[PDB]
UniProtKB/Swiss-Prot annotation:
It is found in: Cytoplasm. The chain holds residues 24 to 230 of 644 of the full protein. A type II topoisomerase that negatively supercoils closed circular double-stranded (ds) DNA in an ATP-dependent manner to modulate DNA topology and maintain chromosomes in an underwound state. Negative supercoiling favors strand separation, and DNA replication, transcription, recombination and repair, all of which involve strand separation. Also able to catalyze the interconversion of other topological isomers of dsDNA rings, including catenanes and knotted rings. Type II topoisomerases break and join 2 DNA strands simultaneously in an ATP-dependent manner. It comes from the Bacteria. This is DNA gyrase subunit B. Heterotetramer, composed of two GyrA and two GyrB chains. In the heterotetramer, GyrA contains the active site tyrosine that forms a transient covalent intermediate with DNA, while GyrB binds cofactors and catalyzes ATP hydrolysis. Belongs to the type II topoisomerase GyrB family. Few gyrases are as efficient as E.coli at forming negative supercoils. Not all organisms have 2 type II topoisomerases; in organisms with a single type II topoisomerase this enzyme also has to decatenate newly replicated chromosomes. It comes from Staphylococcus aureus (strain MRSA252).
């Protein structure tokens, strides 16, 4: 299932080049866009963090955490273990703010490192996905381009007016850059 994504990456994302690397971001952002189109999220945040980790945050309902009829595993674990981004990431973390609780799970090459755990309390709702693209899959470059992400984030904000979409570059902690889009 998920081992097939690691052997044929291009079959799922197109290429293991700069284009494919950026497609990973788009596959996570699209989920937050779906949550905004469903009527629950109105704020999306994309962060290029240190060592080219990507953090995508929305203020939707939070990916469901309820135990399933099929697996006996939380809905979020089922969803993430079928995720191409998760399969192609050397590391991926999830934080779900839901039911006044903060739930967390980490994966390595799509494989869960521990069971979903409650790690805090919250008055907010939403999902946080942090991932570090697998450097063995992505050989050409693992370095994100700001202008490529910005150009697309601005188009998404224009296609989904009323949704606040923010892009931040934190790779240089001494010089942080931010572009926030919010069309009326
Ligand atoms: C950072 C990436 N953001 C998300 O993945 N946001 C997100 N919010 C969700 C809410 C529901 C959701 C919550 N409550 C009730 C529902 F019916 C759906 C379901 C999903 C989901 N479902 C299938 C695949 C991927 N994501 C969400 N993703």
């Amino acid at each position: 299932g998920l081992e097939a994504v690691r052997k044929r990456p291009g079959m799922y994302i197109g290429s293991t080049s700069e284009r494919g690397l950026h497609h990973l971001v788009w596959e996570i952002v699209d989920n937050s866009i779906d949550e905004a189109l469903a009527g629950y999220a109105n704020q999306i945040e994309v962060v290029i963090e240190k060592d080219n980790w990507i953090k995508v945050t929305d203020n939707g309902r939070g990916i469901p955490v309820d135990i399933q009829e099929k697996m006996g595993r939380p809905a979020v674990e089922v969803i993430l273990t079928s995720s191409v981004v998760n399969a192609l990431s050397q590391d991926l973390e999830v934080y779900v703010h839901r039911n006044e609780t903060i739930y967390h799970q980490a994966y390595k090459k799509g494989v869960p490192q521990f069971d979903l755990k409650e790690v805090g309390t919250t008055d907010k709702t939403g999902t946080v996905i942090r991932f570090k693209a697998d450097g063995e899959i992505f050989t050409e470059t693992t370095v994100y381009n700001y202008e490529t992400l910005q150009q697309r984030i601005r188009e998404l904000a224009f296609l989904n007016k009323g949704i606040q979409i923010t892009l931040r570059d934190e790779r240089d902690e001494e010089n942080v850059r931010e572009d926030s889009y919010h069309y009326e």
